[PDB]
Design a protein around this ligand. Sequence first.
Ligand SMILES: *[C@@H]1O[C@H](CO)[C@@H](O)[C@H](O)[C@H]1NC(C)=O
Ligand SMILES: *[C@@H]1O[C@H](CO)[C@@H](O)[C@H](O)[C@H]1NC(C)=O
Ligand SMILES: [Ca+2]
Ligand SMILES: [Ca+2]
Ligand SMILES: [Ca+2]
Ligand SMILES: [Ca+2]
Lengths: 397, 397, 132, 397, 132, 275
Amino acid sequence: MEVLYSLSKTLKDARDKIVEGTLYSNVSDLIQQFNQMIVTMNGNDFQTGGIGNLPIRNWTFDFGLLGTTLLNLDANYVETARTTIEYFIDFIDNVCMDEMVRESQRNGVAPQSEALRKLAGIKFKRINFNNSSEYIENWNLQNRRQRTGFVFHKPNIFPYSASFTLNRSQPMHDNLMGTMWLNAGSEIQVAGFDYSCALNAPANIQQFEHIVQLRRALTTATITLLPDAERFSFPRVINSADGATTWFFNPIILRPNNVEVEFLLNGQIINTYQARFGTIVARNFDTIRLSFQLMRPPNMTPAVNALFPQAQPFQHHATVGLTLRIESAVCESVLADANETLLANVTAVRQEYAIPVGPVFPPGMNWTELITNYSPSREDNLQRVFTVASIRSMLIK
Amino acid sequence: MEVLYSLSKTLKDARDKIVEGTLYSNVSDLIQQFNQMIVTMNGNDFQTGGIGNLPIRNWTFDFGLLGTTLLNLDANYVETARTTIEYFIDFIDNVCMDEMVRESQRNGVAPQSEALRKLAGIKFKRINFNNSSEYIENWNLQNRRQRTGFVFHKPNIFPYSASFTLNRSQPMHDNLMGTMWLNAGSEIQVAGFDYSCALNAPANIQQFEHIVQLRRALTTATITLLPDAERFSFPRVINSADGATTWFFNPIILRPNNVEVEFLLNGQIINTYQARFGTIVARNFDTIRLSFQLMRPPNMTPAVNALFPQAQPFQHHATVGLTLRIESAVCESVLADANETLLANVTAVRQEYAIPVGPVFPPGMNWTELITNYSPSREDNLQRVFTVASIRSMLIK
Amino acid sequence: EYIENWNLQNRRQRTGFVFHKPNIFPYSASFTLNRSQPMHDNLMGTMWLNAGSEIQVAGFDYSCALNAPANIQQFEHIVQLRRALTTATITLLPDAERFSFPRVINSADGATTWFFNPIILRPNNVEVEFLL
Amino acid sequence: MEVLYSLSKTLKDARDKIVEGTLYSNVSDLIQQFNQMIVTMNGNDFQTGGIGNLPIRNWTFDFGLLGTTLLNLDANYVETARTTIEYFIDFIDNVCMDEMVRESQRNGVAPQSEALRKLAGIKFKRINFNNSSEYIENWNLQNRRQRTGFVFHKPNIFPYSASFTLNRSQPMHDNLMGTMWLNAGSEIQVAGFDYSCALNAPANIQQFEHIVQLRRALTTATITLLPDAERFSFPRVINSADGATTWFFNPIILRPNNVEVEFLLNGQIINTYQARFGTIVARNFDTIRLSFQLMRPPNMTPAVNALFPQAQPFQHHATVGLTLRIESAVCESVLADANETLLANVTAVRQEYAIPVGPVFPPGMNWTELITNYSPSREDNLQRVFTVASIRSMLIK
Amino acid sequence: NGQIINTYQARFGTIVARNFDTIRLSFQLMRPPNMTPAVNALFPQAQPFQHHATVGLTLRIESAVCESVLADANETLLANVTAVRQEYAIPVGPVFPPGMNWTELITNYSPSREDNLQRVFTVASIRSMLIK
Amino acid sequence: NYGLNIPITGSMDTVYSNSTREEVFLTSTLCLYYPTEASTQISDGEWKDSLSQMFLIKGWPTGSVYFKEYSNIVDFSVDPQLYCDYNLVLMKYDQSLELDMSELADLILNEWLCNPMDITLYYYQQSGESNKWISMGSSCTVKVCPLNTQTLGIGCQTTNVDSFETVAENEKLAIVDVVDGINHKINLTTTTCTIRNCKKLGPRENVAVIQVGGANILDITADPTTNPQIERMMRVNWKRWWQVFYTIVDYINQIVQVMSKRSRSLNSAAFYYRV
Ligand SMILES: *[C@@H]1O[C@H](CO)[C@@H](O)[C@H](O)[C@H]1NC(C)=O
Ligand SMILES: *[C@@H]1O[C@H](CO)[C@@H](O)[C@H](O)[C@H]1NC(C)=O
Ligand SMILES: [Ca+2]
Ligand SMILES: [Ca+2]
Ligand SMILES: [Ca+2]
Ligand SMILES: [Ca+2]
């Protein structure tokens, strides 16, 4: 697959550096690279496609090389250059789509899409140009495995899950206690609540805790922590734990006093931030532990005093929230982002040609259950298709 | 330090371009650079570390040159190069790590880390290869004094700050008027509230104003301005200014009418926008004045009329609000973002080895206290360590 | 990439620009009302904000689907991009936030203002159709 | 490490093939390997030990090459060769015992034990002989990224758990219904009980389910499924849910009807077996879901009728059980077995030399707490020490 | 740095300090256990308290060695710099206080201020070599 | 031991469904409690049969509806036994019965836990705001005498009952509150009236108090500040008892929709007597 990436890169550089009027000095090395690609692909008959609606296409290469003695390129030259470059761009496009659609459970890293295997043969190692891109460099450093890392802006590491736990409850749901939460994308939003406003808690303080287990540990994550989670700070009617009935939630928000967040890697406390909002940093972690508290305000102006009674009704319910957003992070294993269209590209090529459901990926490349169950086979096959998509996006975009 | 960046760049190039089967045309000039680097670095003894828990290490270089007679690179070339390259990468990683943990109250930009100080000498000036990344480019410009520019995405120029001001107050907190604001990251959410909904105000128009001062003058910033500041648009129980009691806030969100945002540089009107929400642009600015108005609606359906009486109680509390995101900007001085991982890198390296609190930086290097007091010495040290972290991230992720 | 696309378009070819969080949508905060009367005591319809890369759309019913067929009220919102995007990654969540707190909103004519006091139910059998 | 394995391999081959009266044709290649091993190791100096009570030892090599001027080896040759071999074996034993005791939470795969670290250098690459054993072959197939596999006989995958859930309970503990389970090594024994023998259950059938999630996915596992969970088929007195009291359990065994065992991988079903017993196979799986049913017999002899009333006493308590053995399996990761002695060897070394409890492994190498939390760093360290232990056991028993 | 480096107890006259960032003067006021009638009438056990007991300490820093640059009673460097700025009416700069008043310059003596102060003081020395 | 310590994790998107079943009775039972004025004004006696026949079309099977007839509000206040599942209590408002109606409402609408009080032997206190003393009988005259820390009556002599202070005289039911934390000596006619030290648990929601007459006067919460309007504190407007019963029958689906069959007790008493 290094051969595939180098093919895409040398076609990109051919489309860019080989332009009218440029000095031959500017492109001599790329000219020799292009000639090497031509001569080492000549006479090789490739076949691509044949899964789903993806058509079966045959590629036969017999192209002329590019002159050398010139001092400045001109239009008579770039015309031949484009006549070859268009065909090659088509070839790598089809190969990338083929490898993206293909898939396997056993030995996922190895290349499917027999065109790509033929490229992985020994005849084609003379094409290897330079493995500069982030994804290809990570691929090599993983292949001869050293520690590596992908950097993500706003990584959708959490699976979309909105839910709640009710520590206190009764079949009329008039006096509840518990924790609502929504983990979606790179947002955590957790809101604890007491319908009695911590009337009978010890020292009028109620503890809320929420543990979030990342499927993959993140590294050097820049995080923004704010109070007053906003999605759980307006009236709602919420289906019960099992859908029997629906209970009313009427929040009135206080600040979360003595909030703390602990970032944990295999149990131990890697980081702990107490009552510190704004931007924080987690050097390395696999679990987040948000622990906040709802304290009954000791002094009550008459309005809030009317709000929180000693009696039973509880027409309003005290809430304390937290928002935690992973602005950027570094991860061992590939994930989707808001900054890179790798998942979008692979899913688009699969949906376009209606590929039947394979053994390992979920149907439709649903990211939620592709990150909920993220076994090593899923992980490394996902990395393969993602890096092929990275190769493709260099040209077809 | 320029030499340190040259080391990192040439190792990255060596790892990406010295690969099996690649032509010598692709890598001839890189091999020349690498041979020059080897010749210069041979016969030196660097020492790295000795602060906190970061362990002392000694580096000695005796490496042979790289071959040049090979037409097309083969395996053995790659193994010889790699056994050199891992050693060099470890050396550069440790040098950057030891540089990121040292401060200097006077003359911050000058190197620390006696290894790096030795590298700064005249002997190693023949390593200077290329200064291409944004951070090294701005470092070179600063030494070459002239305008520097760092482009940022969601810059967290605003220190975390949530607070309110009351221009009309009672000990019972039943007829209030004033503003509340959260400045956090790239967000300014401001909300002016009036409990009387502008009964006795002039023409039933209550003017709200909010002044935000940037610690550095952002340039060519795209800003998303929306009405209806969400965080201050639901019921809340807020401690009073002195903490004596707590008052109740029960919003009703009116339109903010005839809003007016001024972007100012040195206290003169650089940009002005009235009633213009969506994407706007601040050319070059240092403060933001957000001025909006709560205008009582003259016509009301009976529901609204019941909400806003002429009487004493004021059960529902009128308010207007603005949200202002700085989507991107260009600053002359280095900042944290939601895109780059430089702050995360530096903070992680400090926390890993438990560096004692240094003279200049705040404890734990928290961005809120670092930006709220962003003196020139702090800016110097921050630029130095951020450039070093960007250098390190070339190789180590 | 900008000069890439410049060349590829100047010599007619397929091309594209990648955007992180593009502001394809013109700013527009509005509503439509399917059930109304000058009193504005009983309303049903949609409110929406298209802003930058956000579509926050909230259907609302004052009767909570009392007389609706099968206690179900259907809401639909169509938004037509000026230029067609491609291979987009999108995030879809419930609970359109900006229309989940009390408001006083001028009418369509602007004559009088009506009060809107939301209680956030859970949108069921949601559907999203991407059309070209 | 490949060098260390090759050293152990060639010492074993020397001890096994250099015996009195052998041809030289038998041992020509081995003598060449041993001679150039002697050449490589001569002139070096290693240090071993220094952690815990493992004594420090300095190894210096200056040995003569084994002769090659014989036709059939005699007693002189063998005696000199043994004088060399005993010293080399002591060196390898100490190197492995030093490598087994050391851990590193950061980069667990890489060599600790400065002796073995020096052996990893480039001078000793010529000692590499062949990598034939299962553990070193998997080490190489993980050194490069390819699908490994370890065959295990009675793998110790299940952490030791012995516990029950009560889906129906009250203080007198007179009418219960729930499940007991023992997971241990390669055994699962799960027994659902109901005190009323499913009087008021829907259709006189009580459903039971037991989910066990392996910490690592098995492959091509041979399994033995039987009814009648043995350990929960006799009277017991069991501590209460909280230990406040104890409750009597008096089983009477019924045959579990429409039993259904499911082997699942990443949520989706891989294998189903309904009312199947004897030996079965799980192709590939991550969790086991054992569901069964206590069906009240419609027809009943008067004796069993007397056993099961409709009133409250319930002197005998109906139960249905399952036993589930893993006879063999194939695993990507590494686990202890009833066949291999690597866990025992590593634990024995640490106990022998009183190694302090390190960062990553639990105290005493407690396998249950090790497999309960099987983080990637812990797995990496475990694989390293296991392959080292196998290398040691090649020579020392 | 909050580390007691020197401690002089009931010793007046000339003293020395190796290196010090803070000075802690602690003293006491002991009511005189015996009292002539004059002082006894001076200090009554009643309330009025018409004369107020005091106890003082004076501390001159006769000479010192500082790593950073400071003004002195022996050096005309600060005077030279300030006079040169005033004679030509230099606009107030971004770093030095208006008029270069030493009190407000040393109340906040940040490193940038120290750097510029050292530069201008050294230039003043160079000038004063010739133009006194 | 219903495992009332572990949290239950729900989900916020799935689904609106049906409640399965519960097999302890064939179906719930509705249960009217009306005063004899209703029967006397109706002047009938097949009318219970007619009301049952009319509930049948509303969708209550025959055996489910039961009727109970108390003499009047004060005579029902003494030991109000709710032998039943969905209790409605029609309380005809009359002037000067405001506090007694409030007493009965606070009694039945809330879940009380009562201990005995041996008045003859010991003094007593009130632990907190939730602790009342409830006295019932043919006639209660609760005379209290608060004692200081030294067991000396303040404003009263413990040896002279005439100086004691009458918090409630000649009541069939008295929910008496006294200052919390002060010992009291009690005196009431032990032959006729009994008294109990009752703490208030949460609310009881089998019972719907339908005030048939005047304005909203029920104040269940002994706190003067709060005066909540419970959903089960119903108030209907009346001229004729036929109209009242017809409204109840017609709207009974909402009456039970605002209640819950769950908070029911084995014994029919209005409190849990914990000895
Ligand atoms: C739930 O109850 C409704 C009541 O009309 C019924 O239509 C529906 O079928 C029930 N649910 C199921 C799954 O049948
Ligand atoms: C209540 O007071 C009367 C006197 O009026 C007395 O005879 C009676 O014994 C008292 N009751 C108790 C229980 O002491
Ligand atoms: Ca009295
Ligand atoms: Ca009474
Ligand atoms: Ca009381
Ligand atoms: Ca009250």
